[PDB]
Amino acid sequence: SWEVGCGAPVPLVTCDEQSPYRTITGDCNNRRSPALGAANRALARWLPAEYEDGLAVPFGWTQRKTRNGFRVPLAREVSNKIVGYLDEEGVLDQNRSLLFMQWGQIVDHDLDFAPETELGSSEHSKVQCEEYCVQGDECFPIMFPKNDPKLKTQGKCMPFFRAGFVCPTPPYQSLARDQINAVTSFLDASLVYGSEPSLASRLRNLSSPLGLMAVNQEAWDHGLAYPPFNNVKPSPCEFINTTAHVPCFQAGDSRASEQILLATVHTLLLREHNRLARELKRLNPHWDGEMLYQEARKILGAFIQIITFRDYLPIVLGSEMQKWIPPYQGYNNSVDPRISNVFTFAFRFGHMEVPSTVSRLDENYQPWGPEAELPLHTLFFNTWRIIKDGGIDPLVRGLLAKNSKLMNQNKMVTSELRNKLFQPTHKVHGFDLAAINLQRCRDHGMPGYNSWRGFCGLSQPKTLKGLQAVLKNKVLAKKLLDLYKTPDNIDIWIGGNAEPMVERGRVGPLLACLLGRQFQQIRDGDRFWWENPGVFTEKQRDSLQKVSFSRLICDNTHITKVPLHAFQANNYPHDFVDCSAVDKLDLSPWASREN
Ligand code: HEM
Ligand SMILES: *[C@@H]1O[C@H](CO)[C@@H](O[C@@H]2O[C@H](CO)[C@@H](O)[C@H](O)[C@H]2NC(C)=O)[C@H](O)[C@H]1NC(C)=O
Ligand SMILES: *[C@@H]1O[C@H](CO)[C@@H](O)[C@H](O)[C@H]1NC(C)=O
Ligand SMILES: *[C@@H]1O[C@H](CO)[C@@H](O)[C@H](O)[C@H]1NC(C)=O
Ligand SMILES: *[C@@H]1O[C@H](CO)[C@@H](O)[C@H](O)[C@H]1NC(C)=O
Ligand SMILES: [NH3+]CCc1ccccc1
Ligand SMILES: [Ca+2]
Questions:
Q1: CA 225 to CA 558: how far, in whole Å?
Q2: What's 235's domain CATH number?
């Protein structure tokens, strides 16, 4: 529209063009248009951004400025009146393991990250956001409404700093503000490997020709590997226990240690990598580290894609899976593979699937120790609970035998996330994910709920009575309309999530459309898609076709009792089999022939 293309990206990329491997940054996936899908580019705008000034100023900023003739409600007020609930009883999903939630988070982290602006590591203005709660520049604090208990305890607000945007980091005043996606759009295990060359390299084991990802040298898990510690201080995993002195983990994605089960699945993936590297060395002793790394990386890449696309997506999207992600018909170099700005909110449906506790299960799948169960809020940036209290295995058994929170129109987000979120740099277990999601919709310039309804070719309710029929909930519809005066103002995150789930799925129609499209595009638009003719051999594919999250567990833990269908709710011992009953990854087709 404006300037041909914006001036100040990562400008130096030379496409090999013959390379059989994905670049780290994701550049060179598309040949005609090489920046497509690459990390640290602008998130895609499926619809034009909507900001109160049309450019950058988020709705809700200027008191006197309406959205469609109405004040937008306080994020935190929306949280309190709609998102919140007291009673955790009866909230569990009777057919989705805890792993179903966790896998979402994993996948999510592979696809998008719009980090908060730096605008200066030296910042008394950072202190001006937290302490004085004054709105300015990139400080966009979440003010507590009147009647809010955090008011009595936490001051006037929750600090909140605006997401980064492309072109410059300091001001931009031409095209509408586009936030950055710091990770590669492609489903390619970038959460394990990195989306930049530094980290990709820091993460690697460059101490031997083995193609290993670097592992923790301080600690071990009954002989199994941990990721390296992130030695940059301040470490918020250090901050949450002064005594334990256990730092956050160091992975391809900076959020890995955000919660203990995310760290857990990260650890499983790292392990898998190294495991794969080692078999490739047995099978191919002639190979340099580089080729071990890459080929392992690529298997791992495909594993994540299969589990996601074969096992995960069908149980999210349900009866819509087929309508949005039909059978693969090969790579198409015209499909846009970028993550959209809206997706990054759509995929936050997962916030409502997170239960209030996490458990450690012993080898009989019973409470491992006296504190088996723990509140979720005590596990944010909590690595010590893995290192100094049982390792990966008891958490993993928890992931299999425990349940995801069912999303519920009267019980949206657990107070673990909604009132007790810990954020790094900040000090309290006292933050609101739901409120944060909402301020962020706004921060990102999101079109309203009805815009997205229009987009998905869905009815656009204009009335209370209209909203009730779409939401299938009178009270919910009233609450929302009492805050947002028009469904046109409902923030996409809360609106989409407000919708009843599709048959066999776990998101409503609007979301299923948004998610389904994105995932269709990331598959169809990916040259390196595992199932694209030529990427793997057709023998290799018959091998890959049998992967399972269960198998991954078996291989990279000492969990010997696993379910066949890891994502559904599974009770021990009935639904559990021995690892022996579970199909293996046959790396035979990876035997190399020089002669
Ligand atoms: C205990 C579990 C979880 C914790 C503590 C958590 C925490 C967070 C936090 C603090 C953010 C940044 C919010 C912001 O400032 O905008 C975030 C972003 C997000 N989360 Fe959640 N989350 C959890 C589970 C999930 C699940 C289960 C999913 C999806 C299934 C999910 C999807 C996302 C997405 C897509 C983003 C935006 C990423 C981006 O910046 O592009 N997370 N998560
Ligand atoms: C900080 O982590 C330390 C490190 O373990 C915890 O202390 C341990 O507590 C358990 C019982 O829960 C004992 O089995 C260990 O022997 C204790 N170790 C030490 C060094 O005291 C402590 O609970 C953690 N504290 C907080 C506040 O989270
Ligand atoms: C790299 O691999 C070598 C050989 O296995 C191992 O001795 C070394 O500890 C590894 N280094 C790191 C940081 O993992
Ligand atoms: C590839 O995608 C584009 C746009 O969605 C469409 O124009 C095209 O016809 C598709 N390609 C093939 C080979 O069917
Ligand atoms: C549980 O969900 C799975 C799909 O994940 C489905 O095949 C199965 O029929 C479901 N079982 C029940 C009892 O709903
Ligand atoms: N998934 C969100 C990860 C996260 C949590 C807290 C601060 C930064 C990032
Ligand atoms: Ca990626």
A1: 12
A2: 1.10.640.10
